[PDB]
Structure 1
Amino acid sequence: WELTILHTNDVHSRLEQTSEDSSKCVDASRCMGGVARLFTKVQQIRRAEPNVLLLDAGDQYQGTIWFTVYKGAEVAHFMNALRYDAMALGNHEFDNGVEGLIEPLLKEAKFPILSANIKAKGPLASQISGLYLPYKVLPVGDEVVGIVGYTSKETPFLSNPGTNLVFEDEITALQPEVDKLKTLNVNKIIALGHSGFEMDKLIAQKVRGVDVVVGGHSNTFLYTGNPPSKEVPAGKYPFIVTSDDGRKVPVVQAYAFGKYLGYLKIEFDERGNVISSHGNPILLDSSIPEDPSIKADINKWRIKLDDYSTQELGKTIVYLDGSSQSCRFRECNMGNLICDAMINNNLRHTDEMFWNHVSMCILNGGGIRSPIDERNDGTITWENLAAVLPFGGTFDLVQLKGSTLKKAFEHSVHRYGQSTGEFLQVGGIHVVYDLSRKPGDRVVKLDVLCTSCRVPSYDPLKMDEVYKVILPNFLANGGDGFQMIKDELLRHDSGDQDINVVSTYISKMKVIYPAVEGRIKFS
């Protein structure tokens, strides 16, 4: 019995086709992804193959103005139009709190939404009961397939789920549900979830009875053969795990941003054992036409985005100096504003051990692409912010040793004076440079804002300590020559869209007035 699994993950609000690097589409003949093109390919496959499941492994929420304006209603609408068969909850599905999940998505989706390791308490438990499920048994052809969901246990540190949800260890929560399905004579089991490739491999190894793992979160690209685009595979597709019980369990993921459709064919025997599997993600490039009806619907929904983009978000009473002559040479108030917004976006529910889990931010000055002039009655719109931050990136959370962060600050000024983009703007960090010293030895003081303290204050950076830092995805991936960040980081989770982080902060503050205050000094 042959099953075709089509799967997406970490689509992150890329409803419209994108450029090759998942930023805004500019040259249509070279654009990729989007839901209209996905529809064409899914429909084609469903014409030809009898036993098809279309699955999403989470993180449809967050990533473009679509999510800012429609807040998940676009996810329900377009996933319903595609006829997804099931979705697992990702961390970003909690970005607008549990109510921002229930109302736009759980109540509107025409497919089951799954997570076995999220447990509710208090009145919420009654309010949400049955709106997401630990698993669903789905009819496929003349057979049935069980799908058991899971969501990163780190979600409370990455999103805004509130204090009435408990995120249990994935393997601990999954095993009893898989065991239950076995007792109900469901012998074909897919684990669909949102914890990252490393956890996916552990689930494949340790959760007895799982036949295939369909994952997400880590934006992992897997491929068998020559890759079709610029993404570099982390492993073959599928990635085969040898389980504790000796079975071969395929693990799949399909990058992010709707650029690829995962495609896995599995051959099962009559007892539900995987005999073999093979496939590859399908690049959704311009050789696949956008479905005209979906495209027309997208264009209709875009009108409200255009309208929103020119509305006042808030006001500034200061010039927002995002000039290169400032931001590539010294502390600039636009950089301070953006870092302050990054930290504010990452205020998460703490225990008593930390005032907040993260206090620190770095931002390459070359990422700041425009000033904003305060003389238009102080108004700031989304369009103004999109001129400052035009790359379509995210502000991500990483863990870095102090030694790595010192190397990054040396890199920031190693060729100072040439208006290069690597000069760092900061938050929660006070740095002093002495440019008369040799490159590599110019950082003479580096103090950081504590997190494990009830009163935030600055102390010297410690070379062995691990620090949480918010920074652009561009830097987390080693852009601007920051190879030490890519190579030495100890954890990396994708964050919110850059423009939206700043827009939310401005709207919360209403009137902003960022100063240059001595975060960066020169001896």
Structure 2
Amino acid sequence: MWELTILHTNDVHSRLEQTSEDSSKCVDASRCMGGVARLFTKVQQIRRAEPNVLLLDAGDQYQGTIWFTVYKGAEVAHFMNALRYDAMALGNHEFDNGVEGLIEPLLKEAKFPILSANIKAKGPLASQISGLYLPYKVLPVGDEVVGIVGYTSKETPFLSNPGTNLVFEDEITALQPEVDKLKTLNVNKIIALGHSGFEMDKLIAQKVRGVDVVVGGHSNTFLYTGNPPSKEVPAGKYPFIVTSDDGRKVPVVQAYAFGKYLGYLKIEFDERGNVISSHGNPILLDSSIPEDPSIKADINKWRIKLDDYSTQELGKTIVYLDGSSQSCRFRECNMGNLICDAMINNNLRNHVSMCILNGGGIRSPIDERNDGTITWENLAAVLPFGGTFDLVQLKGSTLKKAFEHSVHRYGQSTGEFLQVGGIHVVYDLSRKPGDRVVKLDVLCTKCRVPSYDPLKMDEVYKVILPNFLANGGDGFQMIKDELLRHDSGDQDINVVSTYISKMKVIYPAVEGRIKFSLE
């Protein structure tokens, strides 16, 4: 038997420092979690104990906090290099700052292979990106070799800005010939490492002949065997077992997000590279694990430059600003109401009364226990993308279809669920998709006293929304296709920041803007 320990992270999203349990800024250091210093301690402890170890990342290191806004990936190359990651697969957020934002800060500076087998470069770009990422890497581990084959979401063109020169093939189509090539090179132990979501990961496990294990990301999937150590509810056992079409049991793993957990899988291989068994569980990187002092001091050095975004108080909150995915993708969330109220307040300076906002665009909560203080740093984790809040004119029919889209596949923690302003929507999830909106009232504009009236299909409404939605992001194709007017607006973070400074003390409530009917 030959035992391999796979350590893995995914969707770290710029949480270089330790954080609160909800992955927002660490205030009470006594109960903080994650961060690269604490992760280092845990990894080193495992490397001391186990002779055959791989530390892998399944993408989306890019984007999430002021670390990325300021260092733009240089912090990722630096601290991943310091942690001695063995390999990384490209995620969609690695393309947020174009191909040049991936090439210069990360690809040219990483000391570990960066992988994607389903990304093919064309035109002038093909010439200089050659060699900076690889379809696979064969890694020596003890007296053996392990093949790692990469993959990135085929949907990346729609999720990010990878440009016109990169082609994203179907993951299964692209993976099979690379796995077959590795098998002809006598590599009998193969890990598929990539960034497409748990559903695609299970499909890769089922269909790509020769993959022994799948390490994934993108869906922030939490898997656990037994009693979970924190608030994340398991979506399945760890590892999640898939029976392949050629009859093999293939473990599929993922480790939630934000560096809160370290994924840990032990695989028992035979001499021909068959998986005899596997077991493990994600390790909660809580305060019981000490933060490595060398890494922590280097984090404290890089932290100096970021304190310009922490010293200015924009305002105060006396309520928890719930920007969690568990709230904002399933129900009305007070962070969504705050952001929509700021959006409407900004354009009103009777003009435009309605706001829609994809809940998945709210990327972090903000805690009120830090003497209620809100800084640019706190808001930057909520709104990291540098988008704008645009003015659009829609038909009632278009809006009805958008609200049907908001809940068409409700229950999967998808970002399309809409947060609102100037709208009172009631859904009935017992009804079929496309017919779940049972009430949709909107604030009148052509009235001297604003009040709620039923939306009319043949009428025209002005809505403030992110450019992400005006461009048909999150499958809101009907908005881009059917809109009547589209005016570009102010930068998202500046809109909210200005609103918080005007109000001084905020207390946004959940107040019945979105409801679900029991009957």
Displacement of 1:56: 0.2
For 1:283 and 1:323, the matched residues in 2 are separated by 19
Distance 1:394 1:138 in 2: 44
CA distance in 2, matches of 1:357, 1:56: 48
Q: Deviations over 1:234-261 (max 9, x none)?
A: 0100011000000000000000010100
How far did residue 203 of structure 1 move?
0.2
CA distance in 2, matches of 1:345, 1:56: 40
Cα distance, 1:391 vs structure 2:
15
* Alpha-carbon spacing, 1:221–1:465, altered in 2? closer, same or farther (3 Å): farther
Report the Cα offset of residue 127 of structure 1.
1.2
Kindly tell me: are residues 149 and 519 of structure 1, through their superposed partners in 2, closer, same or farther at Cα, counting changes over 3 Å? same
Conserved 8 A contact 1:88-1:114: yes
CA change 1:304–1:438 in 2 (3 A) is same
Between 362-371 and 200-209, report the one with greater CA deviation.
362-371
Describe the shift of the 1:513–1:50 C-alpha distance in structure 2 as closer, same or farther (beyond 3 A): closer
Question: What secondary structure is seen at the aligned counterpart in 2 of 1:182?
Answer: helix
Distance in 1, matches of 2:181 and 2:348, equals 38
Deviation at 1:228, TM superposition (A): 0.8
Q: How does 1:483-498 map to 2 (within 5 A)?
A: none
> How big is the shift at 1:307?
2.1
Q: How far is the alpha carbon of 1:137 from its aligned partner?
A: 0.4
Secondary structure at the residue paired with 2:469?
Answer: helix
1:23/1:392 contact within 8 Å kept: no
Q: 1:408 to 1:35 in 2, by over 3 A?
A: same
Provide the TM-score with structure 1 as the length reference: 0.69
Cα pair 2:408 2:434 within 8 Å, conserved: yes
The alpha carbon displacement at 1:330 in A equals 19
Change in Cα spacing, 1:76 to 1:298, as seen in structure 2 (3 Å) is: same
1:330-388 CA deviation, whole Å, 9 max, x = no partner?
9999989956999999999xxxxxxx999996359999999999999999982695699
Could you tell me how far apart the structure 1 residues matched to 2:111 and 2:121 are?
Answer: 22
Shift of 1:26: 1.8
Contact kept, 8 Å, 2:23 with 2:364, in 1: the verdict is no
Cα deviation, 1:460-512, whole Å, max 9, x if unaligned, reads 98999999999999999999999999999999999999859978999999999
- How far 1:21 moved relative to its partner? 1.1
Offset of 1:158 from its aligned partner? 1.0
For the pair 1:502 / 2:503, whether they are aligned, the reply is no
Unaligned 5+ runs, structure 2: none
CA distance, structure 2, for counterparts of residue 346 and residue 50 of structure 1: 60
TM-score (norm 2): 0.69
Structure 1 residue 23: Cα displacement: 1.1
Write out per-residue CA displacement over residues 437-475 of structure 1, whole angstroms, 9 at most, x where no aligned residue. Answer: 999999999699999999999999899999999999999
Q: Structure 1 residues 128 and 269 mapped into 2: Cα distance closer, same or farther (>3 Å)?
A: same
Paired positions, count: 516
Against the structure 1 CA distance between its residues 522 and 170, is the aligned structure 2 distance closer, same or farther, given a 3 Å change threshold? closer
Residues 23, 391 of structure 1: 8 Å contact kept: no
Give CA deviations for 1:13-66 in whole Å, capped at 9, x if unaligned.
Answer: 111111111111121111110000000000010011000000000000011111
SS in 2 for 1:11: coil
Aligned equivalents of 2:76 and 2:467: distance in 1?
A: 24
The 1:488/1:302 distance shift into structure 2, 3 A limit, reads farther
Judged with a 3 Å threshold, the aligned counterparts in structure 2 of structure 1 residues 465 and 264 are, in CA distance, closer, same or farther, namely: farther
Structure 2 contact 119–168 (Cα < 8 Å) conserved: yes
CA contact under 8 A between 1:158 and 1:495: conserved in structure 2? Answer: no
Cα 1:305–1:30 shift into 2, 3 Å: same
- The more displaced of 19-28 and 174-183 is 19-28
Identify the range of structure 1 (254-263 vs 385-394) with the bigger mean alpha-carbon deviation: 385-394
Change (3 A) 1:298 1:269: same
1:366 to 356, 360, 369: 360
Describe the shift of the 1:399–1:373 C-alpha distance in structure 2 as closer, same or farther (beyond 3 A).
same
Whole-angstrom CA distance in 1 between matches of 2:44 and 2:58: 20
Offset at 1:178? Answer: 0.3
The superposition leaves residues 282-314 of structure 1 with CA deviations (integer Å, 9 ceiling, x where unpaired) of: 010010000011111111111101124569999
Per-residue Cα deviation, 1:248-286 (whole angstroms, up to 9, x for no partner)? 000000000101000000011111110100111001001
Identity of aligned residues (%): 100
Task: Provide, for residues 62-86 of structure 1, a one-character-per-residue CA deviation record: whole Å limited to 9, x for no partner.
Answer: 1111110000000000000000000
Three-state SS of the structure 2 residue aligned to 1:346 is helix
Deviation of 1:165 after TM superposition, in Å, equals 0.7
Give the 3 Å change call, closer, same or farther, for CA 372–92 of structure 1 in structure 2: closer
Aligned-pair Cα RMSD in Å? 10.7
Unaligned runs of 5+ in 1: 349-355
**Higher mean Cα deviation, 194-203 or 156-165?**
156-165
Q: Distance in 1 between matches of 2:287 and 2:19?
A: 11
Asked whether the equivalents of residues 68 and 500 of structure 1 are also in contact (C-alpha less than 8 Å), the reply is no
How has the CA–CA distance of structure 1 residues 103 and 411 changed in structure 2, closer, same or farther, with 3 Å as cutoff?
A: closer
Q: Quick one: structure 1 residues 465 and 24, their matched pair in 2 at CA, closer, same or farther if it must change by over 3 Å?
A: farther
Q: What is the SS of the residue equivalent to 1:223?
A: coil
Alpha carbons 2:25, 2:378 under 8 Å: kept: no
Shift of 1:160: 1.0
Q: Per-residue CA shift, 1:408-448, capped at 9, x if unaligned?
A: 98999999999999998758999999999999999999699
Change (3 A) 1:108 1:478: closer
Tell me which moved more, 25-34 or 472-481. 472-481
The structure-2 alpha-carbon separation of the partners of 1:440 and 1:37, relative to structure 1 and needing over 3 Å to count, comes to same
Q: Quick one: structure 1 residues 437 and 269, their matched pair in 2 at CA, closer, same or farther if it must change by over 3 Å?
A: closer
- SS of the residue corresponding to residue 496 of structure 2 reads helix
CA gap of 1:469–1:55, structure 2 versus 1, over 3 A, is: farther
Preserved CA contact (<8 Å) 2:7 2:54: yes
